[PDB]
Scaffold this active site. Sequence first.
Site, short mmCIF file in Angstrom:
data_model
loop_
_atom_site.label_atom_id
_atom_site.label_comp_id
_atom_site.label_asym_id
_atom_site.label_seq_id
_atom_site.Cartn_x
_atom_site.Cartn_y
_atom_site.Cartn_z
N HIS A 183 -64.42 71.08 -26.64
CA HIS A 183 -65.80 71.16 -27.07
C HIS A 183 -66.52 72.12 -26.13
O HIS A 183 -65.95 72.59 -25.13
CB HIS A 183 -66.46 69.77 -27.01
CG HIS A 183 -66.48 69.22 -25.62
ND1 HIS A 183 -65.43 68.50 -25.10
CD2 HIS A 183 -67.37 69.39 -24.61
CE1 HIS A 183 -65.69 68.23 -23.83
NE2 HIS A 183 -66.86 68.76 -23.50
N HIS A 216 -73.60 65.06 -29.94
CA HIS A 216 -73.70 65.50 -28.55
C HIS A 216 -73.09 66.89 -28.36
O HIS A 216 -73.54 67.66 -27.51
CB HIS A 216 -72.97 64.54 -27.62
CG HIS A 216 -73.37 63.11 -27.79
ND1 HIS A 216 -74.63 62.66 -27.48
CD2 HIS A 216 -72.68 62.04 -28.22
CE1 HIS A 216 -74.70 61.36 -27.71
NE2 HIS A 216 -73.53 60.96 -28.17
N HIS A 239 -70.57 73.15 -24.25
CA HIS A 239 -71.96 72.89 -23.90
C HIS A 239 -72.67 74.23 -23.92
O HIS A 239 -72.09 75.24 -23.50
CB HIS A 239 -72.04 72.29 -22.49
CG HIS A 239 -71.20 71.05 -22.32
ND1 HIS A 239 -71.71 69.78 -22.38
CD2 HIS A 239 -69.86 70.91 -22.12
CE1 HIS A 239 -70.73 68.90 -22.22
NE2 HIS A 239 -69.60 69.56 -22.06
N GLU A 279 -72.48 74.01 -17.58
CA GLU A 279 -72.59 72.82 -16.75
C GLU A 279 -72.28 73.18 -15.29
O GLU A 279 -73.14 73.03 -14.40
CB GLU A 279 -71.66 71.74 -17.30
CG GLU A 279 -72.06 71.36 -18.71
CD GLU A 279 -71.72 69.92 -19.04
OE1 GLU A 279 -70.53 69.58 -18.98
OE2 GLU A 279 -72.66 69.15 -19.34
N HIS A 304 -64.81 73.25 -22.63
CA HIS A 304 -64.02 72.21 -21.96
C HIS A 304 -62.82 71.85 -22.83
O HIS A 304 -62.99 71.33 -23.93
CB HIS A 304 -64.86 70.96 -21.72
CG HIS A 304 -65.90 71.17 -20.69
ND1 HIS A 304 -67.02 70.37 -20.56
CD2 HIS A 304 -65.98 72.12 -19.73
CE1 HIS A 304 -67.74 70.82 -19.55
NE2 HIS A 304 -67.14 71.88 -19.03
N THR A 321 -68.75 64.70 -17.74
CA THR A 321 -70.12 65.16 -17.60
C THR A 321 -71.07 64.53 -18.61
O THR A 321 -72.27 64.86 -18.61
CB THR A 321 -70.22 66.68 -17.72
OG1 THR A 321 -69.92 67.04 -19.07
CG2 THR A 321 -69.30 67.40 -16.74
N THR A 322 -70.59 63.64 -19.46
CA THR A 322 -71.43 62.83 -20.33
C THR A 322 -71.10 61.37 -20.07
O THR A 322 -70.00 61.05 -19.59
CB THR A 322 -71.18 63.10 -21.82
OG1 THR A 322 -69.89 62.62 -22.20
CG2 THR A 322 -71.30 64.56 -22.15
C1 LIG Z 1 -63.94 55.41 -22.76
C2 LIG Z 1 -64.04 56.60 -23.69
C3 LIG Z 1 -64.48 57.85 -22.98
C4 LIG Z 1 -64.60 59.09 -23.86
C5 LIG Z 1 -64.93 60.33 -23.05
C6 LIG Z 1 -65.04 61.62 -23.84
C7 LIG Z 1 -65.38 62.82 -22.98
C8 LIG Z 1 -64.42 63.79 -22.73
C9 LIG Z 1 -64.71 64.91 -21.96
C10 LIG Z 1 -65.98 65.05 -21.42
S1 LIG Z 1 -66.34 66.47 -20.42
N1 LIG Z 1 -67.73 67.07 -20.89
O1 LIG Z 1 -66.46 65.98 -19.07
O2 LIG Z 1 -65.30 67.42 -20.68
C11 LIG Z 1 -66.95 64.09 -21.65
C12 LIG Z 1 -66.64 62.98 -22.42
ZN LIG Z 2 -67.74 68.84 -21.69
#
Ligand SMILES: CCCCCCc1ccc(S(N)(=O)=O)cc1
Ligand SMILES: [Zn+2]
Length: 257
Positions: free
Chosen positions: A91, A61, A93, A103, A116, A195-196
């Site tokens: 990470h 992802h 996007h 995003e 992020h 956001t995922t």
């Molecule tokens: C119950 C486990 C959940 C793992 C969630 C991992 C995750 C971290 C940050 C973001 S983001 N793109 O909003 O920064 C998305 C997903």
């Molecule tokens: Zn993210």
Amino acid sequence: HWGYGKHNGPEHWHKDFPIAKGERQSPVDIDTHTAKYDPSLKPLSVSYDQATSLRILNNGHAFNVEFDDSQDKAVLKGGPLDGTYRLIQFHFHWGSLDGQGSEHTVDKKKYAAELHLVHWNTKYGDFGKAVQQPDGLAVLGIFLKVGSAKPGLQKVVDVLDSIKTKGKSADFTNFDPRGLLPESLDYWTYPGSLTTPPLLECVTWIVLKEPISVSSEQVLKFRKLNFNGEGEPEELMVDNWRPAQPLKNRQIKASFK
Ligand SMILES: CCCCCCc1ccc(S(N)(=O)=O)cc1
Ligand SMILES: [Zn+2]
Ligand code: NA
Ligand code: NA
């Protein structure tokens, strides 16, 4: 499972994650004219001097640079936050083309990518318990535009060949995330979500006003990663962003006048 293709992307996520239509989903468009300066907002306190990076992982992802979050090393405090939030991973996007990839948007403008830096509230003891709380996470978001290279990003770029496909990881010790910040820490903030999937509504978003510049070659190398695993048909890892979601009953606050 979920992804970013036509058959498993953001328009499908609500079927397995109905909170996708919730009241505080992310990302959002930041309307700069209606964000209100809040003079009670504190300066952001980014304390990354003792950060301990460990590993970089292609999770199918994006790629995550993971940190040692066992102890209070890299932390985010201040700003809109109460207490202390520990860095666990960062990470990005990004898009297939320079004109898309972020995003969050700013007055509808899309940046080429968005970084992020993910932190969890230490009052909850572990990341897993933090994501069961409405103030469990703080994500520091930083826009990327294409121009001059970002020197502090190059070590990331040059390891990507070794994690091309889903499930591959590599050692990634002694990386300093301070090299990914812009000069200014002026920010916008609002309450939102991951956001995922699982799209959990735990996040205080802190989005920096000032983008960082990266070179065309740096972002081109992000786009050579693969969503697929080794031995599977090649699907370039591009356009791994969720579009802006309805703001609903929320306000975005600015730290700066
Ligand atoms: C119950 C486990 C959940 C793992 C969630 C991992 C995750 C971290 C940050 C973001 S983001 N793109 O909003 O920064 C998305 C997903
Ligand atoms: Zn993210
Ligand atoms: Na407002
Ligand atoms: Na430890």
